[PDB]
Amino acid sequence: NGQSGRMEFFWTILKPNDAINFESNGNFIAPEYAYKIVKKGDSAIMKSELEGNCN
Amino acid sequence: GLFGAIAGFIEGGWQGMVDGWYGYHHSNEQGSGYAADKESTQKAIDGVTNKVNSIIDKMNTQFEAVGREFNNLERRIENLNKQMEDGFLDVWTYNAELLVLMENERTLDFHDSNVKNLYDKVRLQLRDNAKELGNGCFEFYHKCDNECMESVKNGTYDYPQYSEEARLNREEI
Ligand SMILES: *[C@@H]1O[C@H](CO)[C@@H](O[C@@H]2O[C@H](CO)[C@@H](O)[C@H](O)[C@H]2NC(C)=O)[C@H](O)[C@H]1NC(C)=O
Numbered sequence: 001n002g003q004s005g006r007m008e009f010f011w012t013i014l015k016p017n018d019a020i021n022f023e024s025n026g027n028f029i030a031p032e033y034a035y036k037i038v039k040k041g042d043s044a045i046m047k048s049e050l051e052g053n054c055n
Numbered sequence: 056g057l058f059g060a061i062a063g064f065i066e067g068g069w070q071g072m073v074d075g076w077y078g079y080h081h082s083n084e085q086g087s088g089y090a091a092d093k094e095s096t097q098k099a100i101d102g103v104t105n106k107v108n109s110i111i112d113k114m115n116t117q118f119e120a121v122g123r124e125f126n127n128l129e130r131r132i133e134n135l136n137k138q139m140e141d142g143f144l145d146v147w148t149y150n151a152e153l154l155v156l157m158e159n160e161r162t163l164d165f166h167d168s169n170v171k172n173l174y175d176k177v178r179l180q181l182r183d184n185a186k187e188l189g190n191g192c193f194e195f196y197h198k199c200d201n202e203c204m205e206s207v208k209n210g211t212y213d214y215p216q217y218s219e220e221a222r223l224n225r226e227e228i
Contacts, residue, residue: 044122045122045124
């Protein structure tokens with residue numbers, strides 16, 4: 001895509017009274033938004049090519 | 056089949072009997088007609104229904120495949136995971152196919168057995184009071200009115216009541 005540099009992304013789960021500490025002096029791609037895991041349940045990532053308003 | 060009745064010594068079923076699986080066709084002076092043996096029919100219905108329900112029941116703890124994703128350097132466990140899934144899918148497909156094949160065979164022979172038992176139920180009542188035609192039919196050595204027909208059908212045949220008139224009719228023969 002025109003770019004010859006690379007970006008490497010990382011993730012972690014931050015437990016409810018824990019804290020995450022970033023320290024950087026460059027090349028940092030900073031979080032702005034994170035995601036609260038509100039509902040854990042049984043779900044799935046279905047690989048499909050389709051997109052039906054039915055139930 | 057296994058018991059020699061269905062498509063055996065009774066060569067053919069009756070389109071005419073429609074209120075059950077097994078039963079009787081009588082023929083006297085008052086007239087003829089088909090009737091189902093309610094008791095042996097209900098027993099078979101209960102047996103087959105429990106069988107069907109038992110087969111469906113035994114399969115509730117069957118394997119359920121789950122989507123799992125892997126990357127280019129996880130090809131081994133990807134393949135392991137696939138073999139595991141196909142592995143159980145193949146086992147349970149065998150189990151369902153085989154169970155159906157095996158119990159089908161037993162079911163056909165079960166009906167054969169219910170029929171052969173019904174024939175024997177009548178035979179053991181009639182004894183020498185009737186002649187085994189050898190086709191599922193018994194020719195009586197006495198007069199069997201509709202009420203008498205009903206006694207054979209509900210297992211209350213009074214053998215000695217007809218014993219004498221039967222014996223006399225056997226001996227002029
Ligand atoms: C994240 O924030 C909370 C709250 O400001 C910290 O929990 C406090 O911890 C002290 C002891 O260090 C307790 O006596 C307080 O009552 C706690 N407050 C609450 C509101 O629960 C927590 O330890 C912080 N975590 C880090 C990793 O800094």
